[PDB]
Design a protein around this ligand. Structure first.
Ligand SMILES: [Zn+2]
Ligand SMILES: [Zn+2]
Ligand SMILES: [Zn+2]
Ligand SMILES: [Zn+2]
Lengths: 66, 66
DNA sequence: ATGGGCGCGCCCAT
DNA sequence: ATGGGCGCGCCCAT
């Protein structure tokens, strides 16, 4: 029955770096991880102008300025 | 050049229904979709007893009582 | 500080 | 209404 069907846990999103075996369930997850290798921090606090790799961690940090 | 890498768009989560050709990028998209085949409406409003197939839709509905 | 995992609920067309 | 797409933000270990 299709009532007992559970979507199989998968990791279709494989890290593009040949020497890295990480795979993820969601694409947004992989995109964040790739920043570990590139050292990219696309987010910035317009206050202290500090850069972050994740948007959530920046949001968290900005709420503390005042 | 890894710095220019962007995860290509894909849809690895396919509907198990043989007569359905739908594929999603995320599994939570597919878990929702399969309720179209089963007609399941799990989220019920405790104020009016009305049933919905999705929790985001119920959530918004719950607000029409206030 | 920052990463893996992923749920809640928005956008917007139906 | 109710479906596909998908981002914000939380949880909790790093
Ligand atoms: Zn990797
Ligand atoms: Zn700052
Ligand atoms: Zn289907
Ligand atoms: Zn109601």
């Amino acid at each position: 029955n299709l009532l007992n069907y559970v979507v199989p846990k998968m990791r279709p999103y494989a890290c593009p770096v040949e020497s890295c075996d990480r795979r993820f369930s969601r694409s947004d997850e992989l995109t964040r991880h790739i920043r570990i290798h590139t050292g990219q921090k696309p987010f910035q606090c317009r206050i202290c102008m500090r850069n972050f790799s994740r948007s959530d961690h920046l949001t968290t940090h900005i709420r503390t300025h005042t």
